[PDB]
Design an enzyme around this catalytic site. Sequence first.
Site, PDB file in Angstrom:
ATOM      1  N   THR A  16       0.805  -1.216   0.000  1.00  0.00           N
ATOM      2  CA  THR A  16       0.000   0.000   0.000  1.00  0.00           C
ATOM      3  C   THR A  16       0.838   1.266   0.000  1.00  0.00           C
ATOM      4  O   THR A  16       0.703   2.121  -0.877  1.00  0.00           O
ATOM      5  CB  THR A  16      -0.999  -0.042   1.169  1.00  0.00           C
ATOM      6  OG1 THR A  16      -1.977  -1.080   0.907  1.00  0.00           O
ATOM      7  CG2 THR A  16      -1.709   1.297   1.297  1.00  0.00           C
ATOM      8  N   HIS A  75      -8.776  -8.519   2.755  1.00  0.00           N
ATOM      9  CA  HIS A  75      -7.811  -9.286   3.553  1.00  0.00           C
ATOM     10  C   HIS A  75      -8.561 -10.378   4.360  1.00  0.00           C
ATOM     11  O   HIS A  75      -8.074 -11.526   4.504  1.00  0.00           O
ATOM     12  CB  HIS A  75      -7.002  -8.423   4.554  1.00  0.00           C
ATOM     13  CG  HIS A  75      -5.837  -7.732   3.926  1.00  0.00           C
ATOM     14  ND1 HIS A  75      -4.686  -8.387   3.557  1.00  0.00           N
ATOM     15  CD2 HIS A  75      -5.647  -6.426   3.616  1.00  0.00           C
ATOM     16  CE1 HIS A  75      -3.857  -7.523   2.994  1.00  0.00           C
ATOM     17  NE2 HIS A  75      -4.422  -6.331   3.020  1.00  0.00           N
ATOM     18  N   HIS A 129      -3.306  -1.210  -5.695  1.00  0.00           N
ATOM     19  CA  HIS A 129      -2.934  -2.603  -6.036  1.00  0.00           C
ATOM     20  C   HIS A 129      -4.222  -3.469  -5.921  1.00  0.00           C
ATOM     21  O   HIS A 129      -5.225  -2.994  -5.353  1.00  0.00           O
ATOM     22  CB  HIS A 129      -1.845  -3.120  -5.045  1.00  0.00           C
ATOM     23  CG  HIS A 129      -2.269  -2.988  -3.610  1.00  0.00           C
ATOM     24  ND1 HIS A 129      -3.295  -3.735  -3.079  1.00  0.00           N
ATOM     25  CD2 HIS A 129      -1.875  -2.138  -2.635  1.00  0.00           C
ATOM     26  CE1 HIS A 129      -3.525  -3.333  -1.835  1.00  0.00           C
ATOM     27  NE2 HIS A 129      -2.674  -2.365  -1.547  1.00  0.00           N
ATOM     28  N   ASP A 136      25.317  -2.958 -15.972  1.00  0.00           N
ATOM     29  CA  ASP A 136      24.734  -2.289 -14.804  1.00  0.00           C
ATOM     30  C   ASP A 136      25.278  -2.978 -13.531  1.00  0.00           C
ATOM     31  O   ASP A 136      24.516  -3.658 -12.808  1.00  0.00           O
ATOM     32  CB  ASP A 136      23.199  -2.437 -14.776  1.00  0.00           C
ATOM     33  CG  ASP A 136      22.549  -1.449 -13.773  1.00  0.00           C
ATOM     34  OD1 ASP A 136      23.257  -0.512 -13.291  1.00  0.00           O
ATOM     35  OD2 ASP A 136      21.342  -1.617 -13.459  1.00  0.00           O
TER      36      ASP A 136
END
Length: 808
Positions: A159, A265, A309, A683
């Site tokens: 979140t 949840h 999300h 990288d």
Amino acid sequence: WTATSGSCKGRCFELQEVGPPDCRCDNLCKSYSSCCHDFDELCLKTARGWECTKDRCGEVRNEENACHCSEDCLSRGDCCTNYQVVCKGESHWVDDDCEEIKVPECPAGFVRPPLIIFSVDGFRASYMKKGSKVMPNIEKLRSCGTHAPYMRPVYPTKTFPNLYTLATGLYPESHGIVGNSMYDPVFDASFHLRGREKFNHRWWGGQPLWITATKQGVRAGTFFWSVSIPHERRILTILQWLSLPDNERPSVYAFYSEQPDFSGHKYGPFGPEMTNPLREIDKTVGQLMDGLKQLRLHRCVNVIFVGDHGMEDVTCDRTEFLSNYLTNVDDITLVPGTLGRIRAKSINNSKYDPKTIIAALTCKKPDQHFKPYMKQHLPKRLHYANNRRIEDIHLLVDRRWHVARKPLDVYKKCFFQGDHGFDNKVNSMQTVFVGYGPTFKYRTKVPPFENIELYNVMCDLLGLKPAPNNGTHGSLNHLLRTNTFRPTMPDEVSRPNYPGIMYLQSEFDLGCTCDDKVENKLEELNKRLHTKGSTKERHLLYGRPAVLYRTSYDILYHTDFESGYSEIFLMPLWTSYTISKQAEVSSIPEHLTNCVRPDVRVSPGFSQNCLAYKNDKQMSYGFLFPPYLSSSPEAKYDAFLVTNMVPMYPAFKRVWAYFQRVLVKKYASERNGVNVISGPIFDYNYDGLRDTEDEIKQYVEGSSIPVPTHYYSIITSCLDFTQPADKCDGPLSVSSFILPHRPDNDESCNSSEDESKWVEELMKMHTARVRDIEHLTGLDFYRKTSRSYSEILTLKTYLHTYESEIGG
Ligand SMILES: *[C@@H]1O[C@H](CO)[C@@H](O[C@@H]2O[C@H](CO)[C@@H](O[C@@H]3O[C@H](CO[C@H]4O[C@H](CO)[C@@H](O)[C@H](O[C@H]5O[C@H](CO)[C@@H](O)[C@H](O)[C@@H]5O[C@H]5O[C@H](CO)[C@@H](O)[C@H](O)[C@@H]5O)[C@@H]4O)[C@@H](O)[C@H](O[C@H]4O[C@H](CO)[C@@H](O)[C@H](O)[C@@H]4O[C@H]4O[C@H](CO)[C@@H](O)[C@H](O)[C@@H]4O)[C@@H]3O)[C@H](O)[C@H]2NC(C)=O)[C@H](O)[C@H]1NC(C)=O
Ligand SMILES: O=C(OCc1ccc(OC(F)(F)F)cc1)N1C[C@@H]2CN(C(=O)c3ccc4[nH]nnc4c3)C[C@H]2C1
Ligand SMILES: [Ca+2]
Ligand SMILES: [Ca+2]
Ligand SMILES: [Cl-]
Ligand SMILES: [Cl-]
Ligand SMILES: [Cl-]
Ligand SMILES: [Cl-]
Ligand code: NA
Ligand SMILES: [Zn+2]
């Protein structure tokens, strides 16, 4: 210590935070235990509830009421949201036909259309279709405005990382909020959900929209709401702010709902208990739009309905325990759940070793539901490594599972049926985006896009210049009716050399051999043309890539491919070739298996050498344009030039050979020809940006040949696949990957099998945007197409995800 003796009298939800300790009346005062004694009484009134009823109409104003149905309420800006419907015979906004909003229809004294961001926690993309019967207000926003089928969150799909990415346009690795729980070893401080440490400014990097707005003279409402302020009061507070005088009134507002995440949840994403939370969200949207309509603002405000999300089905039984794998379980700290992050429990433990933790976690059980990675080896599309807050060892957890350190953690710290946090390409983690208002398009569907892109558009909506961020400004212009941002292509910084033949064969001492001494201006004038660029229009379809940094490089043309060869890194930056649907795969002839040929356009001093590869017992070499796809036996010799060679671990050559030999032709068959650009990426500091020469940590032994950390390919064809890739008249279609160049295939638990059972799964996991490759290589692609530049920006942010279609 707060001296809470002042009063909130006429200060309820005041917009300037007064400093400690005069007492506070804002939506953050609860969090700080700093509210004045009378905050609840004055600012959180609830008397009579949230709706007007017929009998309240015209009532005498009673200031104790939560909201009002008296005559002066419109001008005090505090009517119940349903006032005009019940008392003045208006209709609810959702009952009105939608009518295109061609221009903002704002009351006098509005300098710009306000922006209201309505964010919903845990709103999974498929709720738009699956709950559509119970969300009429949301359905109307979506069908009348501009919507995407889904919006991709950032990883991890938790979140705080995602709300703050929404606010900043930055990857969590850059904004600093890399989880819901964190340890910063420099500060020696821990960030937790429960607590006070989390408000401390040093956690929060970048520049969030409310700050960008404030520094540029645009006022903002509060982005944060205390859990205990009911949604109805949040809506009424926003509406009241929208009635402030011109000089006081914010232009940007945010609303936040804890639903549907909170019920998701407990009950899972499609639990029967989930209908009510979706109904309730919708009723809240309805109250907001009805309130805007009473304020004559419903055709003035741009409204964004956006999630952070989605939500996946996850239960306690689907938990992997690190105690089943590690002998030493008490010497590590795990951040647990839908991702794992591991570090040593004590920095004084000299016996702690990450390589043995990783090995103990690697492909240990047939059905293992997590995979360990050193953070630098995670798929580059997650952009999850460059922050000291991200532990070196990471576990990517399969969707629907958790990881925990020991069984005791789960039963003595099922509780729950939903969770999120997983890889941000997973369908269940996708979320929603709808824009509605004068500045968004009317009844328009736009393709999925990533949430890092929204900040730029929110800046555009508000006339603000965005702070430097990870969005690609212009890639979302197609969502907007006006306020588009018209970027110019970046200027090429280095111009190429075009070397002709300058060196004799005997000037080279590279220890390379090739069986090539058997060889008529017929096929001789022809080969000169090829070396001068004559087939270049077939293999370079979108112009040469531009080099956006200072370097020395050469363009090399060949019958079957073109390359940009770096004299500094001794290998191409890019190699470009087109393979038609009709092309044929050949094998390397036996006599040519070890053939490497000097390139008489490039000095020995700027060439690799075969000796270094002989001597390096770990490193072998591959080719960027694949000899298997050569157009003719004679053309095949070009593919063995020393300037087309690149260093490859034997384990990686298995991956690369299958790509080159099997998959390229397969894509050409399916997509009606493809153009491929491939090259190396360096990288070593895992910051997602191209390394300069002095950052390179590994060279082919006894040489100056740098070893790439990754190899990329960008595979472009015609979106209308009835047209061949080299004769495409319209939009393009692309998929790209950035494969890590690893000396083992430990990431692929099936790797002892034939490449046909594991290589493509590996490639899918390392899917990428062309923009990701641009950052990593300092190249800019698609400089000469027939498409608008904005459409090309959109194509460069495209991610091929390989998930099946969102829905059922
Ligand atoms: C996604 O978009 C973002 C934003 O555009 C991209 O990130 C930018 O990348 C730039 C290049 O890496 C980087 O520029 C540097 O700025 C340095 C000053 O930085 C501070 O000021 C800015 C502006 O306000 C601020 O944003 C920074 O905030 C970071 O750090 C704070 C505190 O830690 C955090 O709260 C915040 O979250 C953010 O952290 C992130 O960035 C830092 C890197 O700065 C990471 O370390 C973190 O993990 C996290 O990712 C800062 O407060 C400036 O000093 C740098 O210049 C040095 O390097 C060059 C090399 O050529 C040289 O010219 C200079 O002389 C100097 O070198 C000296 O220091 C070296 C290193 O210490 C030393 O080795 C040398 O010997 C020298 O003495 C540099 O220009 C920029 O800060 C970030 N911005 C942000 C917000 O992250 C990101 O790249 C994009 N991602 C992708 C994939 O495209
Ligand atoms: O008031 C807020 O919202 C400001 C905002 C709005 C739009 C924003 O977006 C943008 F800037 F773009 F408008 C940014 C910030 N918030 C966001 C916070 C979430 N939270 C949690 O405790 C939490 C919640 C759900 C979880 N699920 N699993 N773990 C979880 C942990 C406290 C809430 C207060
Ligand atoms: Ca070797
Ligand atoms: Ca780098
Ligand atoms: Cl976390
Ligand atoms: Cl292998
Ligand atoms: Cl360089
Ligand atoms: Cl889905
Ligand atoms: Na393996
Ligand atoms: Zn949640």
